[PDB]
Amino acid sequence: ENTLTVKMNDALSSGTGENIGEITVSETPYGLLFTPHLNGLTPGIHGFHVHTNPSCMPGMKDGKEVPALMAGGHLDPEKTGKHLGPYNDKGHLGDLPGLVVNADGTATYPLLAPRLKSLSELKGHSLMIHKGGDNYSDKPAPLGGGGARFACGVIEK
Amino acid sequence: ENTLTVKMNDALSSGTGENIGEITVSETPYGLLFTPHLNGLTPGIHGFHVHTNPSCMPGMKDGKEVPALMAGGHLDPEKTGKHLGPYNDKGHLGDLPGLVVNADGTATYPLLAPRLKSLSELKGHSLMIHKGGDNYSDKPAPLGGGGARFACGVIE
Ligand SMILES: [Cu+2]
Ligand SMILES: [Cu+2]
Ligand SMILES: [Zn+2]
Ligand SMILES: [Zn+2]
User: Any extra detail in the entry (chain A)?
Assistant: First the structure.
């Protein structure tokens, strides 16, 4: 393909929740462009990453159900172990720019991830929108401060 | 490392208004990164572009003083005459990603312009923040719908 469309749903401790739209991913000469067509989100910047597993299912951790835990960690085929954002090749390949949410809860602003070059790199993985933001660092909080997983979609094929 | 710090000031019909912070420009392997440290803006997305002239002063047009008119138009060394945004090399080279302003009126979210590669490409030009947004197209409104010029900073 030259584009793909990822449906995004809210992540619940019990499974999958409300559909909040889709994200269209296209290839550009500068990398992958993520153009959201979403609603249902808190205004501001949200952590936004490709995660390793093609699942948005919840999982148990320290006694409690965690929404979208089965998506696994940030996509990291080079096993860097480091959350350094979309502009640093020393960290997770799955680190995308923060998702920008408008005051009415829609997300429309397009996001360029220059380190990703082909839609093939997304196949068999998941897209994640977090409750918190992303300062592209593991300091002062791990994983950019994204925290909990709010919405999720699977890229199959 | 080599970075530029561009002070940004409100643009008024009578001249230059109050400072609203600065934008730090850095070079990355993927292009220039504009990291804003601004305040005093309306929440939302603002048209954000490099303009040709190293001035932010106002000027008269069709009988009215226009804020920051002296910056000229969008930087366009290839004379494309088209506004197509930061990801499309068929339009103005000066087209940057829209400036993201938080609910409290501050701008902190960093913006990558992949088509710009060296800080030297910004010397002798200006950075412009518009009142309106930017849909990276000349339709439905020309120049992405940025409209009037709200704040501006000279580089060199
Ligand atoms: Cu994530
Ligand atoms: Cu402009
Ligand atoms: Zn990461
Ligand atoms: Zn333009």
Answer: Encoded by a cryptic bacteriophage.
Identity of the residue in B43, B97, B109 whose CB atom sits nearest the CB atom of A103: B43
Q: How was this structure determined?
A: X-ray
Chain B residues closer than 8 Å to A112 by CB: 86-87, 97, 112, 114
Domain residues for B155? 1-156
Check if the beta carbon of residue B23 is closer than 8 Å to that of residue B127.
yes
Nearest to B148 by CA among B12, B19, B24: B12
Determine the 3-state secondary structure of A122 from DSSP.
helix
List CB contacts of B81: < 8 A, sequence separation 6 or more. none
Question: Considering its fold, how many domains does chain A have in total?
Answer: 1
Resolution of the structure, angstroms = 1.6
Residue type, B1: E
Helix (H/G/I), strand (E/B), else coil: A132: coil
Q: What is the CATH number of the domain that holds B71?
A: 2.60.40.200
* A94 near B CB under 8 A: no
Closest CA to B30 of A123, A112, A149: A112
Q: A71 and A56 in contact (C-beta within 8 Å)?
A: yes
Nearest Cα residue to B21 out of B45, B2, B3, B41: B41
CA A88 distance to own-chain centroid: 17
